[PDB]
Structure 1
Amino acid sequence: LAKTKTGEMIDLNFARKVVEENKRVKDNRGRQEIVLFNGLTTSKLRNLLELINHVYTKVYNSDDTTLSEDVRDELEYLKVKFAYESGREPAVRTFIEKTYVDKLVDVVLKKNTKKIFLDYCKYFEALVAYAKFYR
């Protein structure tokens, strides 16, 4: 897929690492209140996943490995949407900055390959799954 800062590998295992690092119990009223990425709820995660899913299925229907200019512009708008969502909610900003998602989509644009985009979608899917599992 790609590499984040300090040369750390980006894999599904690293997705579990990221989701567990920001996973804390923070029990309240004698009841466990699971907190992920400082108040990030599942709904925001699923909205971001669906944002991924659109261009995912668009690339999946495609045959050529090279990302068409339509996919390039879709990923540019994906960056725009990620920035806007991060600005709207502090939890989404924390999730994006911890998960290096925008760096990953920039790398996907740089590679201009179907395989890298699939790997990025799988990493995003992993993050969602792990978050659902630990919640």
Structure 2
Amino acid sequence: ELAKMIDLNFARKVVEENKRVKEIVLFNGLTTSKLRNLLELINHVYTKVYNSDDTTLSEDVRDELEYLKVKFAYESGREPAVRTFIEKTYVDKLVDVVLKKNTKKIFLDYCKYFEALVAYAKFYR
């Protein structure tokens, strides 16, 4: 329940629409490696978030999430396919609302949404 709706069903349906078959090509040609690198960054922040027990995001994880947004923008600039994927799934906007909420729960559902995106992207291939 992040924003507008944005849920795991949104992830499955958006991967379905952006899927096109010629071979299977998703999000105008996004390889699984770029998505895996993005998920690796997600894992790097998520491990630190999970290890801490307090329900409020610390300053360190907030700075790491701003870094994650910057990395998202860099990846979009590097490859058009990653840019189209980021725009169609609005991941950076979810990062922004996670920053706005300052709650561990919102980050956790954001990570769940990202993992659902990865899972459905692999499944439809």
- Relative to the length of structure 2, the TM-score reads 0.96
* Aligned equivalents of 1:7, 1:72: Cα separation in 2: 19
Alignment pair present for 1:24 and 2:24:
no
**Number of residue equivalences:** 125
Are the structure 2 counterparts of residues 90 and 6 from structure 1 closer, same or farther at C-alpha, using a change threshold of 3 Å?
Answer: same
| Cα deviation, residue 8, structure 1 | 3.7
Deviations 1:53-77 (A, max 9, x none): 1110110000101000001100010
- Quote the residue 2:52 is aligned against: 62
In structure 2, runs of 5+ residues without a counterpart are none
CA contact (8 A) 2:76 2:82 kept: yes
Deviations 1:18-75 (A, max 9, x none): 100101111xxxxxx1010001011111111111111101100001010000011000
* Aligned equivalents of 1:7, 1:84: Cα separation in 2: 24
Deviations 1:63-122 (A, max 9, x none): 101000001100010011000000000000010000000000000000110110000000
Identical residues among aligned pairs (%): 97
Q: Relative CO higher for 1 or 2, CA cutoff 8 Å, sep ≥ 6?
A: 2
* Aligned equivalents of 1:69, 1:8: Cα separation in 2: 26
* Aligned equivalents of 1:7, 1:106: Cα separation in 2: 11
In structure 1, runs of 5+ residues without a counterpart are 27-32
Indicate the structure (1 or 2) with the bigger Cα radius of gyration: 1
Are the structure 2 counterparts of residues 97 and 60 from structure 1 closer, same or farther at C-alpha, using a change threshold of 3 Å?
Answer: same
Find runs of 4+ consecutive structure 1 residues off by over 2 angstroms.
5-8
| SS of the residue 2:115 aligns to | helix
- Relative to the length of structure 1, the TM-score reads 0.89
Alignment pair present for 1:115 and 2:105:
yes
